[PDB]
Amino acid sequence: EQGKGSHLVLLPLPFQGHINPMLQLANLLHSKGFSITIIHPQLNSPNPSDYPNLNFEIIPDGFPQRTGIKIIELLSAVNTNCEAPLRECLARLQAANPLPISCLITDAILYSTQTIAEDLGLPRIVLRTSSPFSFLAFAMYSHLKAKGYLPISEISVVELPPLRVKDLPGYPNTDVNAHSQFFEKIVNTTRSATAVILNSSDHLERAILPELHREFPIPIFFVGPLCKSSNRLSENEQSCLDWLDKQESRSVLYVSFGSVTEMEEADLAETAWGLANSEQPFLWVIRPGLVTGSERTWPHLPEGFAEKTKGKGWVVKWAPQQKVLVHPAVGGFWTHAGWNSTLEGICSGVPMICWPRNGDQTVNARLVSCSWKVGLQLEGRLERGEIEKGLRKLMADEMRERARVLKETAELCVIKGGSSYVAMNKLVNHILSL
Numbered sequence: 001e002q003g004k005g006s007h008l009v010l011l012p013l014p015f016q017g018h019i020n021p022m023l024q025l026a027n028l029l030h031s032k033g034f035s036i037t038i039i040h041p042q043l044n045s046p047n048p049s050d051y052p053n054l055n056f057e058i059i060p061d062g063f064p065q066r067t068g069i070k071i072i073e074l075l076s077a078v079n080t081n082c083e084a085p086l087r088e089c090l091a092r093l094q095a096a097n098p099l100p101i102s103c104l105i106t107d108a109i110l111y112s113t114q115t116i117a118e119d120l121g122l123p124r125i126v127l128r129t130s131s132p133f134s135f136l137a138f139a140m141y142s143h144l145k146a147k148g149y150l151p152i153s154e155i156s157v158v159e160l161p162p163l164r165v166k167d168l169p170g171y172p173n174t175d176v177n178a179h180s181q182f183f184e185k186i187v188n189t190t191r192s193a194t195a196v197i198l199n200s201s202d203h204l205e206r207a208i209l210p211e212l213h214r215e216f217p218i219p220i221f222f223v224g225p226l227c228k229s230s231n232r233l234s235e236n237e238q239s240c241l242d243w244l245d246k247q248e249s250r251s252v253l254y255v256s257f258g259s260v261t262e263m264e265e266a267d268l269a270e271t272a273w274g275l276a277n278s279e280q281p282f283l284w285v286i287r288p289g290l291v292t293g294s295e296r297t298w299p300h301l302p303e304g305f306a307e308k309t310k311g312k313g314w315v316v317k318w319a320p321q322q323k324v325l326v327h328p329a330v331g332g333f334w335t336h337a338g339w340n341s342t343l344e345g346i347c348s349g350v351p352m353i354c355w356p357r358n359g360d361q362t363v364n365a366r367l368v369s370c371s372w373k374v375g376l377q378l379e380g381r382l383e384r385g386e387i388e389k390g391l392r393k394l395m396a397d398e399m400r401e402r403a404r405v406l407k408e409t410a411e412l413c414v415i416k417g418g419s420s421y422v423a424m425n426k427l428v429n430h431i432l433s434l
């Protein structure tokens with residue numbers, strides 16, 4: 001097997017939407033014959049028992065922490081508090097097995113791994129877990145400031161169709177200058193690696209593919225969708241599947257806003273009443289930590305909601321999302337348009353309604369609704385009226401046919417001969433050549 005005898009160390013950023021593709025990549029590479037060490041902070045640490053073919057080294061992260069505000073601060077804090085323990089753990093790993101790490105594969109957001117890799121003389125490959133389209137925005141961010149797109153709504157960003165100003169990637173309560181600093185750091189430490197892995201396919205990116213290559217001085221591998229590649233479900237996850245088994249085919253709206261976005265009580269109430277008033281069956285994930293600054297207890301739902309929706313809805317703290325999405329009862333997906341959830345909806349043929357919040361979410365949601373046209377976007381603060389219109393519109397009536405095509409195209413790119421199967425074999429060769 002091609003990689004046997006080659007030790008790769010993969011470094012995810014410690015949140016689920018980053019851990020998940022890094023470890024899909026990990027399992028894929030292990031199946032190509034590599035030995036895989038994951039190094040991870042204790043923060044949101046994955047379960048080793050779900051990845052029995054991977055070796056796990058857990059490091060102290062020196063920290064709770066809010067994930068929906070002050071995002072540049074949090075992400076700089078993750079880099080900083082983990083850096084010294086990472087350095088010492090990598091050095092101990094080399095010393096403790098002089099019998100050698102071939103490569104470091106690092107989340108693009110962990111820009112601290114560049115200095116670490118240079119000091120250890122190790123080659124780096126950067127994994128970008130956001131949408132490849134969003135990279136184009138990050139790369140030309142100061143140019144978008146130049147042309148007066150930023151700061152600040154529906155004006156077409158002509159350089160980046162179909163994006164509007166309001167779709168450009170950003171973080172709450174954050175100035176253009178802070179955005180330019182941060183994005184330029186991630187862009188630079190991606191461009192300084194030996195290669196960049198993108199979690200998408202040649203076909204999904206066809207409209208921008210030439211442009212993408214030109215924004216990187218280094219080779220690019222389109223190995224996704226990586227989700228197309230556990231050992232025990234929690235109580236909340238297993239109830240998801242048992243409840244769906246009772247529901248009519250394609251009748252369920254699955255609702256989940258990822259692992260890190262946040263809401264206040266009032267937005268959650270509008271969600272809830274919009275959901276209830278739409279009268280659609282729904283599986284709603286309200287993760288611990290979604291709702292901030294409230295004084296009420298999980299699931300923070302308005303009084304009367306459970307009563308009005310008994311029989312129609314199921315509320316949980318976590319869902320086995322990928323199994324939920326291929327489940328025959330699931331007919332739509334209200335997402336925040338995180339890239340993993342976008343891909344997972346595409347791979348499952350499930351039309352989506354998008355309420356993006358920050359980062360590439362706003363890019364992805366516009367792509368879902370305008371470019372791939374496999375779903376719709378809620379524009380805006382959530383308001384129950386507009387939400388119910390969106391949910392009834394999603395679950396009624398074509399979009400499904402385009403979603404079916406996209407799904408089939410994703411199946412074909414990952415099998416033998418597919419562009420992503422090819423691209424992963426070139427990646428393996430790039431790794432072996434280092």
Ligand SMILES: O=c1ccn([C@@H]2O[C@H](COP(=O)(O)OP(=O)(O)O)[C@@H](O)[C@H]2O)c(=O)[nH]1
Binds near residue numbers: 017257258
């Ligand atoms: O109840 C949930 C919610 C999310 N996810 C997974 O968490 C990840 C979230 O990544 P995404 O890019 O969608 O958003 P992020 O969480 O990074 O904002 C995806 O792989 C989802 O399948 C899950 O397994 N269960």
